[PDB]
Amino acid sequence: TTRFKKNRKKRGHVSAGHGRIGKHRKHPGGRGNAGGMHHHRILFDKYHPGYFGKVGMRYFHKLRNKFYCPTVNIDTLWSLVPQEVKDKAAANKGTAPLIDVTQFGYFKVLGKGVLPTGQPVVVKAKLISKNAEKKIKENGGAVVLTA
Amino acid sequence: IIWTKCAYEKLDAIYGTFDKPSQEKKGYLLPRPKMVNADLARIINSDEVQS
Amino acid sequence: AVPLLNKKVVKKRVKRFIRPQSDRRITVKESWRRPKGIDSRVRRKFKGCVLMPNIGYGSDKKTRHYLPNGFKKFVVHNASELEILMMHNRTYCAEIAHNVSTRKRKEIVERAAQLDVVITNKLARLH
Amino acid sequence: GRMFAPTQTWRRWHRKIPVNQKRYAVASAIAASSVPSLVLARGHRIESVPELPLVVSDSVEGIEKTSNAIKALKQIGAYPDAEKAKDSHAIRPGKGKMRNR
Amino acid sequence: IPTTTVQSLENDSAAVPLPAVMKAPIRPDVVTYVHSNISKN
Amino acid sequence: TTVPGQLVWEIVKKNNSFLVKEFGNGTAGVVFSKEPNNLYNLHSYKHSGLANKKTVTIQPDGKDKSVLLATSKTKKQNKPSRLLNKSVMKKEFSRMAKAVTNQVGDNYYRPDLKKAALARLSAVHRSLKVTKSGAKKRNRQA
Amino acid sequence: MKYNPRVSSSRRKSRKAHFTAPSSVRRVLMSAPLSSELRAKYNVRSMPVRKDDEVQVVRGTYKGREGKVVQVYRKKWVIHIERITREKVNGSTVNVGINPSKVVVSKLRLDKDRRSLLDRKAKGRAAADKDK
Amino acid sequence: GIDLVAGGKSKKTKRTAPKSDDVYLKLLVKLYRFLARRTGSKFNAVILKRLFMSKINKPPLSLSRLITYATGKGDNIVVLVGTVTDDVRAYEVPKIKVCALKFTETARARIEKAGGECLTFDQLALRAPLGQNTLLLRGPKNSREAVKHFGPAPGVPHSHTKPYVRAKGRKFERARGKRNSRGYKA
Amino acid sequence: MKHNNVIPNGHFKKHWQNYVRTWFNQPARKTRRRAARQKKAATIFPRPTAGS
RNA sequence: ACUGGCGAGAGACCGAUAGCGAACAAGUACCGCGAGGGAAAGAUGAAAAGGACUUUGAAAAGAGAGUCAAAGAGUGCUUGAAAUUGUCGGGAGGGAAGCGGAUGGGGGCCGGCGAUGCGCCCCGGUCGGUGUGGAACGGCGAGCCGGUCCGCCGAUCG
RNA sequence: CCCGUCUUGAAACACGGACCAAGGAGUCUGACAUGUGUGCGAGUCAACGGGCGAGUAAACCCGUAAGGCGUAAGGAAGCUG
RNA sequence: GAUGAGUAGGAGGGCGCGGCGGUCGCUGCAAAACCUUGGGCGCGAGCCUGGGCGGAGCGGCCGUCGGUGCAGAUCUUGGUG
RNA sequence: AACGACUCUCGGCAACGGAUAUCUCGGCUCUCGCAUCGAUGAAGAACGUAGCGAAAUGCGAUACUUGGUGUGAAUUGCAG
């Protein structure tokens, strides 16, 4: 929006806000990331530690699908069950719902948070952390593995 | 705006209500205002405030 | 109509603020411009130089925008717009817009007489 | 010579406002049309309109002739607003008149 | 429940309940912002 | 309006077809409102004819020095053609003055507009007399 | 509003097509209304002006004048009418050009083609306007 | 001359009004301008000031955090100058009276199902003109991405400030200056 | 270069202005493809328009 | 896919120092041995009705006259700014002038530049007046509380 | 004391400026960032495309295991979370 | 109630130019532009108006947009001392 | 130290110049449709060609056009 640009407020002020002494020259410090080690050294070290150098192993032709592993925490597991199925869970304590996280696009079950009180759940997943399994078991549930 | 009877009767289905959602705008609900009653005079001159 | 204003109008300055050196150069118009030059003696407010406008010259808020006749001007373009001043005839006077035809000025002038609304330029283009 | 910063076709002409905001704007406009004070404030002449919102029988949808369409507007009191539009027909001031406007 | 009268034309239920959309908030700021941006399209 | 008047004022106070502004938005700015139900033609929430359910209209009626006194009906805010309760008055000023005081202040319709309504009636009545006969005094003394 | 994709609403294109139109096209553009008597007779509203037609001027300073066409000056978008003249500074007489849309045809120069044209113009009106 | 700073005038800036053009918010400001002036209530003064604040100064409050702070205070009315969001991590929602500028669709449904009530600030004025028996709450102001980048620069000692990097991985600011094996660790 | 900002990596050092692809024909492309489908449907009638 | 060719539609684009170099006999006139370089230049009037004739002059042309709504539109002619120039009128000037502030002299300009009403009396004229009838409505919420208009009595003032 | 300008310092024997008209310079775009306005909110986004539609370059509708960003981090990695 | 300097620089509130979406108007009983020893308003950018010329268009207000404001650049083109 | 000349200055008129305003058969940009040069001699170049023409436009010794078809009374600056 041109009418809000501050250059308009500076019309008639000679230097357009860039000063009489310093002026606005083309590239008085080099272009782009020039001088990262010489005259912009302080800037890089102060704000971008680790910028220069090499670390770790290369991986030629690394495909990300091999590493696909979405995770879901314990505290979020109950939210996957439909509301109508939640009522059934509290209506019969003999059985427990079977939550197959893979059907909801999750592979591994992590163990952040707690489960609903007095509600056993059977969790079906590809992978699971030890804390997640412990919390499921101590709540009266069980873990089933799939692929 | 001049509404035909058929068009006027479709407004609830198209835009839904504050309680149930629209039938043609999947998962849409009418927005709520930050002020339920915009009549300041009633609020300011109410017995509760004036007491 | 009797003007409602009663406080006298005090003009802090009646001369205009002329742009510096507009006398010297034809291309430099008289409309005010703040001199931005580093050495500008006008900007630096040396005595015996052109004066610059500042807020201290502001007129009294009670008498601001009041014409010498004691009313404030409102520009009218037809008879309907003139009726807006019926309840403010002691405060606002009407001025017919410069581009209104002489035929429509007669209607406005006649209507203003009925409403006791002052017209600043009622004699315009009637000869 | 060459103008400063010549205009380019790949200027960002269009805008994509979120759909939910566009629906919010439409709902507000629909609600505003049922308030006679707002309708009058926008310049519409609805002094002879029987009621707002103005809902008419579905038989109006069967009208085929423009002469019958105008008679329908007269019956419901909407003709004065339509007459205002015709009487306001005028040539656009400025350069727009030679730009097919 | 509020209802709206249905005007009848010459040569032709007479009320309809007021739809909820007619009670929606009036937000001139939102309308102006949306109107200006979409009119560029 | 069908919605609260305070809400309407928030919407129409910035821009409406009846808003007349001149001399920009600086100190020289002058603002008037020209809706028929605004006694003083002032752009304010008090006198606004758009943002108040209860409004007073006083203007010449047809011919024969008749003055129209119309008030907006509280239960007809959604019926523009029947919103006004018109009362054409063609009697002496004193009789008309009592009628305005009765329909504005006595019934607690808009007591805050009693002074404006009487002045509006006084201005309208005087202009009708001048129209019939013509200007005879300049009203410049005092 | 127009809906034909082959038709332009551009002012520039309309004016160019009018002022560069060939002579055959200018003939149709230079049409005049028939008189109320001829309209009721042939059931035709407009006709291209011809050299030997008789017309009456209904607009301009020569309003009311009647005479016979003597020249259809298509290049100048005007027609010349017998006795509709003015005097130059030297006293010579020159015909005054009049746009054919500002005259009314009182008598038609009928011929084999003109009569056939009248039938086609009336045939459409007698069906598309009345029978519909 | 007078030996003062800036002619004795204040150089501080605070919001004296909302920056928004929302007509409903301005009506609420008018309502609470009157309440603060004519009552002298500290609750009303605080409410008025918070209505002026920007979006980031009115952070949302999760329903789960609302429940924890409302435990043992059923009689009191919860007041939030901001938005109340739903939290899937909370299972049991007790009945509670909550006043907020805005409720998310899921948060409103859960509160209403549990027998609670969702109030606006105009309804609060009718029930608590002086803020009597209210629980005034604020959402977490500094829990957002921008704040993680604030403070001492990432490269100075004893800094945990998050740097600005276009991606995350071994090749993005993990080298010299980030470990002893490459010059130094910082 | 100044202040705390992400390191810029704009790939605008070639003659990129000669290789800009605009999309002003996007509505036209939708129209043309719809016409092609409509024309194809009549050609293969009564065979299903969904194809094989 | 498509800044070429041919045809077509459109525009929050430019409006004759702009927009293509080119709105026009423009890739033209012109320049360069050559490869190449490359302009300026749109608008009388609705209609030529484009100024007969008289008189002066070698002629250009002037004076008068004529056409036109208009030559204060007269063939580079719509409108016709500034720099700059002539003339008439006012004024000033002992090696600059201009400029800020303050008055004065001389000009020019301004009747919303400055009013003539108001109150109380009677003479006349004119125009309307408590209580009951109708007409179309309203405020407050079934019921109370009202005004406007028309008519009829009384009242006899305004 | 002549303006504009660089300058510790300009009436300067520092430079530009004979005069007038018109033209004449922080823009567009990609990335990112803080701030603010608006919508929704553990979600959000109609973006390629499709269905259509002011007989229509707009508007309206469509995300079914789509995708982006967010919802979990640490490690060079194997991995753990 | 106190208080008033400001280069480089920052910000706010305003003035002016040309479009677009709206709205309110003006004009052959004379629009725009231009001229004026007419008058007035605003601290100011500017605005309003008388008279003249001109002979067909133009303006106010809300929103929104931009090839949007010149005394200078040995600035460009044209004109003139 | 008048008058007048000269210089400067203000106003009226007259010049000089072509700004401004209003225009526009042009330009620019976007979108769409179509696929058609040449040894059967192309693009380009040259010369010629009309009752009165130099250019532009057209044409080729059948030379601002022949023929067919459509349209249905002009062309036009003058002459015939």
Ligand SMILES: [K+]
């Ligand atoms: K700066």
Ligand SMILES: [K+]
């Ligand atoms: K493309």
Ligand SMILES: [K+]
């Ligand atoms: K050129």
Ligand SMILES: [K+]
């Ligand atoms: K002229």
Ligand SMILES: [K+]
């Ligand atoms: K310098």
Ligand SMILES: [K+]
């Ligand atoms: K130097």
Ligand SMILES: [K+]
């Ligand atoms: K110098």
Ligand SMILES: [K+]
């Ligand atoms: K930054």
Ligand SMILES: [K+]
């Ligand atoms: K997603």
Ligand SMILES: [K+]
């Ligand atoms: K989809």
Ligand SMILES: [K+]
């Ligand atoms: K490691």
Ligand SMILES: [K+]
């Ligand atoms: K307008």
Ligand SMILES: [K+]
């Ligand atoms: K003037």
Ligand SMILES: [K+]
């Ligand atoms: K604008």
Ligand SMILES: [K+]
């Ligand atoms: K002189």
Ligand SMILES: [K+]
């Ligand atoms: K002179």
